[PDB]
Design a protein around this motif. Structure first.
Motif, PDB file in Angstrom:
ATOM      1  N   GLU A 102       5.679  -5.016  -9.624  1.00 15.61           N
ATOM      2  CA  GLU A 102       6.920  -4.713  -8.899  1.00 15.61           C
ATOM      3  C   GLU A 102       6.757  -3.580  -7.883  1.00 15.61           C
ATOM      4  O   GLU A 102       7.473  -3.543  -6.876  1.00 15.61           O
ATOM      5  N   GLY A 107       4.324  -3.288  -5.926  1.00 20.25           N
ATOM      6  CA  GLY A 107       3.726  -3.877  -4.746  1.00 20.25           C
ATOM      7  C   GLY A 107       2.369  -4.450  -5.066  1.00 20.25           C
ATOM      8  O   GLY A 107       1.570  -3.825  -5.776  1.00 20.25           O
ATOM      9  N   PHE A 108       2.104  -5.641  -4.546  1.00 15.46           N
ATOM     10  CA  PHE A 108       0.793  -6.237  -4.707  1.00 15.46           C
ATOM     11  C   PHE A 108       0.414  -7.010  -3.461  1.00 15.46           C
ATOM     12  O   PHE A 108       1.235  -7.234  -2.572  1.00 15.46           O
ATOM     13  N   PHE A 109      -0.853  -7.395  -3.400  1.00 17.11           N
ATOM     14  CA  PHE A 109      -1.414  -7.951  -2.193  1.00 17.11           C
ATOM     15  C   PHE A 109      -2.622  -8.818  -2.550  1.00 17.11           C
ATOM     16  O   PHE A 109      -2.864  -9.086  -3.727  1.00 17.11           O
ATOM     17  N   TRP A 146       4.631  -9.710  -3.472  1.00 17.02           N
ATOM     18  CA  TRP A 146       5.576  -8.600  -3.381  1.00 17.02           C
ATOM     19  C   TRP A 146       4.911  -7.480  -2.593  1.00 17.02           C
ATOM     20  O   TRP A 146       4.568  -6.433  -3.147  1.00 17.02           O
ATOM     21  N   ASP A 147       4.707  -7.723  -1.296  1.00 18.94           N
ATOM     22  CA  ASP A 147       3.968  -6.774  -0.467  1.00 18.94           C
ATOM     23  C   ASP A 147       4.798  -6.043   0.574  1.00 18.94           C
ATOM     24  O   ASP A 147       4.439  -4.921   0.940  1.00 18.94           O
ATOM     25  N   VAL A 148       5.871  -6.668   1.066  1.00 16.70           N
ATOM     26  CA  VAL A 148       6.649  -6.084   2.156  1.00 16.70           C
ATOM     27  C   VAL A 148       8.083  -5.693   1.809  1.00 16.70           C
ATOM     28  O   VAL A 148       8.792  -5.164   2.656  1.00 16.70           O
ATOM     29  N   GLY A 149       8.526  -5.904   0.570  1.00 13.08           N
ATOM     30  CA  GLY A 149       9.795  -5.324   0.145  1.00 13.08           C
ATOM     31  C   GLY A 149      11.025  -5.943   0.773  1.00 13.08           C
ATOM     32  O   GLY A 149      12.019  -5.257   0.993  1.00 13.08           O
ATOM     33  N   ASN A 199       8.395 -11.333   1.852  1.00 11.98           N
ATOM     34  CA  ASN A 199       7.552 -11.523   0.669  1.00 11.98           C
ATOM     35  C   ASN A 199       7.268 -13.009   0.455  1.00 11.98           C
ATOM     36  O   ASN A 199       6.168 -13.407   0.067  1.00 11.98           O
TER      37      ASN A 199
END
Lengths: 176, 4
Positions: free
Chosen positions: A50, A52-54, A74-77, A81
């Protein structure tokens, strides 16, 4: 040279986000002045997704695939995403311009390659849904934004890469 | 990076 990607820390358990088609590749930088590529990969491996991941990290002359592609992220909020084909993090711990440039070149090349793999235009921060988008561009343009992130432009500027230069490199490829 |  052949592109080499280290998949040793590929975190398969990350969540599915949205559905195909994924129209974007996201260009990030870590906002971490001290971490190495392995530090970033190891933290990404264990962290609460949650936060952030990539999918990829570029640093220390290496490329690591740390999450799935063609999966969302879940990288750009915010709403984009669900457009993340891939999300690439450039490290920020370079001591010199030469070391930065080794990684910057890999970063440009990988972003371009991922766009090709996804069937997306090699464009940077255009208004079209499809293409390569920076976190800054996502923050400023996506629906349901909750981010304040504006990477990777500030870090690129630290090492003398302007907005125009970054765009030119993405869109035309690197030259000498 | 950053679910939002």
């Amino acid at each position: 040279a052949s592109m080499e990607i280290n998949v040793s820390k590929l975190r398969t358990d990350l969540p599915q986000v949205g559905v195909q088609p994924y129209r974007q590749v996201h260009a990030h930088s870590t906002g971490n002045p001290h971490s190495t590529v392995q530090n970033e990969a190891d933290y990404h491996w264990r962290k609460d997704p949650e936060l952030g991941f990539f999918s990829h990290i570029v640093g220390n002359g290496a490329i690591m695939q740390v999450g799935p592609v063609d999966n969302g992220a879940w990288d750009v909020g915010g709403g984009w995403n669900a457009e993340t084909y891939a999300a690439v993090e450039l490290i920020e711990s370079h001591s010199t311009k030469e070391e930065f440039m080794t990684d910057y070149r890999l970063y440009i090349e990988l972003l371009r390659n991922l766009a090709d793999e996804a069937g997306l235009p090699k464009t940077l921060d255009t208004g079209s849904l499809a293409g390569i988008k920076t976190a800054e561009y996502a923050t400023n343009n996506q629906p349901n934004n909750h981010s304040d992130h504006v990477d990777p432009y500030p870090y690129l500027a630290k090492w003398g890469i302007s907005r125009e230069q970054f765009k030119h490199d993405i869109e035309n490829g690197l030259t000498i | 990076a950053x679910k939002x």
